[PDB]
Amino acid sequence: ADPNDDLFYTTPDNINTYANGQVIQSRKADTDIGNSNKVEAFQLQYRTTNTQKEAQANVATVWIPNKPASPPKIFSYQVYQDSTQLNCAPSYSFLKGLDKPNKATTILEAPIIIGWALQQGFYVVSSDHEGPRSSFIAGYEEGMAILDGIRALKNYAKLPTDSAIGFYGYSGGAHATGWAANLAGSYAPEHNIIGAAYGGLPASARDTFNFLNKGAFAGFAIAGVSGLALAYPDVETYIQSRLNAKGEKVFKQVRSRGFCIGQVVLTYPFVDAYSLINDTNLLNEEPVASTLKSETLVQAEASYTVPVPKFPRFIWHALLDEIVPFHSAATYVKEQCSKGADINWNVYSFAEHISAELFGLLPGLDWLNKAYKGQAPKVPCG
Amino acid sequence: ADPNDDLFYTTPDNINTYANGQVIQSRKADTDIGNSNKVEAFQLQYRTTNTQKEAQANVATVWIPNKPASPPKIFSYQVYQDSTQLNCAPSYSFLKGLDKPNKATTILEAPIIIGWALQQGFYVVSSDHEGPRSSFIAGYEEGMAILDGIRALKNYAKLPTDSAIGFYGYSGGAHATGWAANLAGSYAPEHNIIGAAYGGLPASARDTFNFLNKGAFAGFAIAGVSGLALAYPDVETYIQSRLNAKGEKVFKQVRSRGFCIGQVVLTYPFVDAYSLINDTNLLNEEPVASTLKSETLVQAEASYTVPVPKFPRFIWHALLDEIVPFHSAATYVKEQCSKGADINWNVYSFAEHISAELFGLLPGLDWLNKAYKGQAPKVPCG
């Protein structure tokens, strides 16, 4: 079934009676990656918490290795869903078959990365990090969803509380991983996190919007505004109020069934987001402006004290990334390092956004493999 | 079964009794794109002709539309296989399941492109253009294999000899498409070609090798060397003779089972191919030097008179292409135009290699759709 027509994606009336990370129900998942590793896969419906601190149900996908490594180890993989529609969700995208509207996102690196993890006997989880509202780039939603998805896996597989946890994500998936890292200490302190490897980090929603708007990848700017609006009802109300006729069409379109990563990129090249409104001060009015100061990891922009995770991290970026700005990510790392972070920082001089994904894969994985053994290299931060 | 263990991929002893394009045998093919489109697909084993003008068997995949357009129309789609190992072949990669080692080459753009064709009621064919020796970048082999694949489809579906034919391919696929075009008038004169759309064309083997070597994508230079040597026994003898111990390991490796596009790219970044050889002057030693003059489309470098196809063409290239050099493709276009070609030339100043594939897709498909209707625009050549 399409997720829009599936009760497994709905929040039951009694959602408040389940704790964060708790499994409401589970079902067998017929996935490509599980079928190709000859492994049992499952969908978990689990309780989590949304941006306004309200209970909601969410879906994650989990793969159980046939020969679990001992002691138990967990691997959390974040997809670059990059879209604001529910049938683009990773869960649905992982299910057997070509014919998923956001298939592109679960079909290139995911099979290698998840296969890699499974071969070494790790438990794997990939959460629907955007949640039931498909709130692309809403960091508090993404962070909590992912940390609760890891909780749901531990619960389901009856794994020790201190089971070592590692993360991988690129671009959209790096925003997601970065926010799980950001919130881990305060929201899920029981997670024993031994490392997170992530690249092409969109550190600042505002900076990434300005870097993308009017460019070839302007679609993702549109999707990001769509996504924030879905996490923040006051922002939805404000944004809807400014949309002109063209803007109303675009925001329906970008939220429509099957409108996923390929549609996003190929429908909106060189679009100017401001042409969808009569409000060239869009980003500079309430509630948008203060929302953006919450939705950044850059302390010099933020309205809160940005957390500084101390566990090993491996972060990489293309110097000439044409999609997600290098400088915001470099600024984040420098800031984090000045406050005692452990960041193994890799600047790829020879790559742009898409090839940085390709060239950071093996370095990221090799490092995470070391981290799981307590062998992450002690290197100067940044 | 793996193509290496499948007799469908072997040449029978009586191959010489079959005509070029004659179907030797056919079988139902359970393909992703067949299933998503709810369409019948088959593998055809057919006779074609190799670089040494000897008969051999090859494989192509065909998709039969549910509601055929009248009069019959054929779409030939060329994959960027980009590897020198039989189990990287398009046919195998098109089959259901993700555990095909070169799966990445048939699950991004292929479903979009082939789907488009089938919805128009077009008969679709994708040949294993590298042939049974996996001779990546051998233009004569690729061209003849493609033109015979189209003959095989005509014969199998019993289509009029003058059914209009269109082509699409990018990068490695554009090399294959370009060489199909190059050889059409002399090799398959009966084909009624209404259009060819191809971008990121490697016009010269020599120039592309020089562009790739020692860089991030040096892997393609190594596979190119492997490929030419697989098409030309005298090149194979020469190269094997020059390989040091490192080189021998590399050429076994680049030809080994499962060593496909991902392994090529990630295994060899920044390799200098000369480190594998005792011959700083390789490109200028025979038989390599003369081979390279046969294996170019650029008349200024070629030792034969390069054909100038007259039918409508749509060619695009990234101005900033970091993989396949713009200048050689632009020179090809300028030369062809001065000799009467019809090339709709499209330069993307905002893109590199990969983003040119993405953003040229819809323009190329839109154009091909006009071409099938006799509506391709009259534009100044080049």
DSSP string, A63-79: EE-SS--SS-EEEEEEP
Would you call B35 an interface residue with chain A, using a CB distance cutoff of 8 Å?
yes
Overall fold of domain A1-202+299-382: Rossmann fold (3.40.50)
Instruction: Report how far Cα B243 is from the mean position of its chain's Cα atoms.
Output: 27
Q: Whole-angstrom Cα distance, residue B168 to residue B176?
A: 10
Q: Whole-angstrom Cα distance, residue A302 to residue A290?
A: 9
- Shortest CA distance to B265 belongs to which of A82, A320, A346, A108? A108
How many C-beta atoms surround the C-beta of residue B159 within 10 A?
A: 17
Tell me the three state secondary structure of residue B371: helix
- Whether the Cβ atoms of residue A317 and residue A326 lie closer than 8 Å to each other: yes
A265, A355, A361, A362, best to mutate vs chain B, most B CBs in 10 Å: A355
State the DSSP code for B106.
S
**Per-residue b or e along B219-236, where b marks 16 or more CB atoms closer than 10 Å to that residue's CB:** bbbbbbbbbbbbbbeebb
Q: Whole-angstrom Cα distance, residue B212 to residue B162?
A: 40
Question: In chain B, which residues fall in CATH 1.10.260.130?
Answer: 203-298
Would you call A111 an interface residue with chain B, using a CB distance cutoff of 8 Å?
yes
How many C-beta atoms surround the C-beta of residue B8 within 10 A?
A: 16
Residues near A336 by Cβ (< 8 Å), separated by ≥ 6? A308, A309, A343, A381, A382
**Per-residue b or e along A65-81, where b marks 16 or more CB atoms closer than 10 Å to that residue's CB:** beeeeeebbbbbbbbbb
- Whether the Cβ atoms of residue A288 and residue A235 lie closer than 8 Å to each other: yes
Q: Cβ separation of A350 and B215 shorter than 8 Å?
A: yes
Structure determination technique employed: X-ray
Instruction: Take residue B45 and report the two structure tokens written for it.
Output: 């084993």
Would you call A82 an interface residue with chain B, using a CB distance cutoff of 8 Å?
no
Instruction: Take residue A276 and report the two structure tokens written for it.
Output: 């969808």
Q: Whole-angstrom Cα distance, residue B296 to residue B110?
A: 27
Amino acid, single-letter form, for residue A171: S
Q: Whole-angstrom Cα distance, residue A299 to residue B184?
A: 62
Q: Cβ separation of A36 and B354 shorter than 8 Å?
A: no
Tell me the three state secondary structure of residue A129: coil
- Shortest CA distance to A103 belongs to which of B263, B24, B176, B112? B112
Reply yes or no on whether B321 is catalytic: yes
CATH of the domain spanning A203-298, picked from 3.30.1020.10, 3.30.420.40, 3.90.480.20, 1.10.260.130? 1.10.260.130
Which residue among B33, B266, B359 sits closest to A216, beta carbon to beta carbon?
A: B359
Q: Resolution in angstroms, to 1 decimal, for this deposition?
A: 2.0
**Per-residue b or e along B242-271, where b marks 16 or more CB atoms closer than 10 Å to that residue's CB:** ebeeebeebbebbbeeebbbbbbbebbbeb
Q: Whole-angstrom Cα distance, residue A263 to residue A87?
A: 13
**After which residues does a break in chain B occur, C–N more than 2.5 Å?**
none
**Which residues of chain B are within 8 Å of residue A358 when distances are taken between CB atoms?**
265-266
Q: Cβ separation of B97 and A355 shorter than 8 Å?
A: no
E strand or H helix that includes residue A198: strand A192-199
Instruction: Take residue B285 and report the two structure tokens written for it.
Output: 């030693």
Q: Whole-angstrom Cα distance, residue A144 to residue A131?
A: 10
- Shortest CA distance to A129 belongs to which of A31, A59, A42? A59
Q: Whole-angstrom Cα distance, residue B223 to residue B257?
A: 14
**Position of tokens 């190594």?**
B222
Would you call A361 an interface residue with chain B, using a CB distance cutoff of 8 Å?
yes
E strand or H helix that includes residue A47: strand A40-49
Q: Cβ separation of B33 and A98 shorter than 8 Å?
A: yes
Instruction: Take residue B314 and report the two structure tokens written for it.
Output: 């749509």
Q: Whole-angstrom Cα distance, residue A35 to residue A143?
A: 29
Q: Cβ separation of A98 and B104 shorter than 8 Å?
A: no
Distances in whole angstroms, Cα of residue B324 to Cα of each of A148, B207, B352? 45, 9, 10
DSSP string, A229-294: HHH-HHHHHHHHHHB-HHHHHHHHHHTSTT--HHHHHHH-TT--GGGGBS-TTGGGSTTHHHHHHH
Helix/strand/coil (H, E, C) string of A281-349? CHHHCCCHHHHHHHCECCCCCCCCCCCCCCCCEEEEEECCCCCCCHHHHHHHHHHHHHCCCCEEEEEEC
What size, in residues, is chain B?
A: 382
Q: Which of B32, B148, B207, B321 is catalytic?
A: B321
The residues pairing with A192 across neighbouring beta strands, listed in sequence order, are A164
**Per-residue b or e along A312-349, where b marks 16 or more CB atoms closer than 10 Å to that residue's CB:** bbbbbbbeebbbbbbebbbbbbebbbeeebbbbbbbbe
Q: Whole-angstrom Cα distance, residue B218 to residue B250?
A: 13
How many C-beta atoms surround the C-beta of residue A61 within 10 A?
A: 30
Amino acid, single-letter form, for residue B250: V
What totals of helices (H) and strands (E) does chain A contain, helices first? 13, 9
Instruction: Take residue A53 and report the two structure tokens written for it.
Output: 């601190």
Instruction: Take residue A73 and report the two structure tokens written for it.
Output: 């180890």
Strands (E), chain B: 23-28, 40-49, 55-64, 73-78, 123-127, 164-170, 192-199, 313-318, 343-348
Q: Whole-angstrom Cα distance, residue B145 to residue B295?
A: 16
How many C-beta atoms surround the C-beta of residue A161 within 10 A?
A: 9
DSSP string, B44-96: EEEEEE-TTS-EEEEEEEEEE-SS--SS-EEEEEE-----SSGGG-HHHHHBS
Q: Whole-angstrom Cα distance, residue A230 to residue B362?
A: 30
Q: Whole-angstrom Cα distance, residue A224 to residue B25?
A: 52
Would you call A73 an interface residue with chain B, using a CB distance cutoff of 8 Å?
no
Q: Whole-angstrom Cα distance, residue B96 to residue B81?
A: 17
- Shortest CA distance to B105 belongs to which of B86, B80, B134? B80
Write out residues 167-186 of B within 8 Å (CB-CB) of A. none
Residues near A157 by Cβ (< 8 Å), separated by ≥ 6? A62, A64, A72, A123
Q: Shortest Cα distance from A18 to chain B (angstroms)?
A: 37
Nearest chain B residue to A109, by CA: B104
Q: Whole-angstrom Cα distance, residue A56 to residue A12?
A: 8
Torsion angle, CA of B28/B84/B82/A260, rounded to 10 degrees? 50
**Which residues of chain A are within 8 Å of residue B97 when distances are taken between CB atoms?**
32, 35-36
List the end-to-end C-alpha distance of chain B, in Å, as a whole number.
46
E strand or H helix that includes residue A164: strand A164-170
- Whether the Cβ atoms of residue B298 and residue B335 lie closer than 8 Å to each other: yes
**Position of tokens 């259009």?**
B195
Question: In chain A, which residues fall in CATH 3.40.50.1820?
Answer: 1-202+299-382
Q: Whole-angstrom Cα distance, residue B178 to residue B205?
A: 13
Tell me the three state secondary structure of residue B374: coil
